[PDB]
Symmetry: C2
Subunit: 268 residues, 2 copies
């Protein structure tokens, strides 16, 4: 019944708001510099980076970089910390997906393990525009250009994310839509090492119906949006890989830099 | 309109039947399926290959294993031959899809160029079962066991297609279904280098509606099958990506020789 699919759609949207302090709506309100009720400080060079520590809460360093964790590492660590924030956040959203917590404890861990970064980049697109990405809860805005100019390695960590987000955002999706799509991603079952696949696919079968109806209702004039969105799941998978291998490179060229256990545990 | 979507399906099916010798319906009668009226020649071991490869309808080389060319290599190059045949079959099919030829020729070459590998592994799965793959227009059956028993490079060449195949076949799709899915794969839109993505996506949109109608009417009880088929695309891409990987590795085994020139040329 439709009435049941809409109720689940309302449910998930609801938990989505409660689990993510920064929705796409808040994000676009800040990005479209019309809503000047609170604008972001912009980082596009080293000076701004320093000055950034001023206006925004940057526990990081302000002055010298190189001989004291150069700019590149500093941002990378900063980015590392947020990812941990997001996982914890995403993990809280997951518990609310009907049926998820009733699965084998092991699978729960496996679903999170593979689905988390795929989710981080999906939601990360909400904080991006062709020119940049929001940081520190919207208060800041770091330039894509400044990012694409960091030290040899770190210099190409976000580019594949921007490329994904610009075309993904062109789908004009909203929080209520993403809420369901985010859940569909978690309850895969095609995930490596699962014990009970049928119970997982039964949940996702629901999420997909929910999403199909939600997209029809929310975007009547958008033919086949449902399918276009599912295919986007390939671009996601590909991004994770580019990243994971990229991560492997730093680890070797930076034996002094560390990887937060929670993020380290996910990668494998 | 459903009428128009029922026409496009039958059209593609008709083209499909005439472009591909071995149909899934046929191949299935031969495989695990009984339908015994001419049992294929089973290659399960080295001698089986040797002792058949001399009676089987294979055109390229013969059983000569004794410091006279390696077996693994002869088998690998054999797939290349068949894949190159397959590529011509697909092209012949691509041309029957409404709108395809009306596209920028450069874009057609780009679409076939990148859609071909995914189409091959998809269709390969029709000739596969959990224990082996039909060979030579269906006159043979090379076991999965023998394939993983191969040397060192070549021992993991086909294993991932088997893992993909077994899950893919779990969907129980038939030639009428595969005919539309295949078309959808060719009419992507995200292939690198395209020049005019719009028409390509318009046709895919039209092809997607067809696959959706087809699956609903053809598999009424199989819920959300459409969504599940579309996510098999991630699996394909990974297969494809991971394949070019061994390809580069193999490129570090056999190479510099003067009797290969005009042969190496047929397969870039
Ligand atoms: C917005 C964030 C998720 C992000 C994504 C992709 C690339 C970089 C970042 C990023 C986020 C915050 C950054 O600066 C600090 C990071 C930080 C936050 C809290 C404690 C320690 C560091 C901040 O904005 O608060 C720098 C980069």
């Amino acid at each position: 019944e439709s009435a049941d699919l809409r109720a689940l759609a309302k449910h998930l949207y609801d938990s989505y708001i409660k689990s993510f302090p920064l929705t796409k709506a808040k994000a676009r309100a800040i990005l479209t510099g019309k809503t000047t009720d609170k604008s972001p400080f912009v980082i596009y060079d080293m000076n701004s980076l320093m000055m950034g520590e001023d206006k925004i809460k940057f526990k990081h360093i302000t002055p010298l970089q190189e001989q004291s964790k150069e700019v590149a590492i500093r941002i990378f660590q900063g980015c590392q910390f947020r990812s941990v924030e997001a996982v914890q956040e995403i993990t809280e959203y997951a518990k609310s997906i009907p049926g998820f917590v009733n699965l084998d404890l092991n699978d729960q861990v496996t679903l999170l393990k593979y689905g988390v970064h795929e989710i981080i980049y999906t939601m990360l697109a909400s904080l991006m525009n062709k020119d940049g990405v929001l940081i520190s809860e919207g208060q800041g805005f770091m330039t894509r250009e400044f990012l694409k100019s960091l030290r040899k390695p770190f210099g190409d960590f976000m580019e594949p994310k921007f490329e994904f987000a610009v075309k993904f955002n062109a789908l004009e999706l909203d929080d209520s839509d993403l809420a369901i799509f985010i859940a569909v991603i978690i309850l895969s079952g095609d995930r490596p090492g699962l014990l009970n696949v049928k119970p997982i696919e039964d949940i996702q079968d629901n999420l997909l119906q929910a999403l199909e109806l939600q997209l029809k209702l929310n975007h009547p004039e958008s033919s086949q949006l449902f399918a276009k969105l599912l295919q986007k799941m390939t671009d996601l998978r590909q991004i994770v890989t580019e990243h994971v291998q990229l991560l492997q490179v730093i680890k070797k060229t930076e034996t002094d830099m560390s990887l937060h256990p929670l993020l380290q545990e996910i990668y494998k």
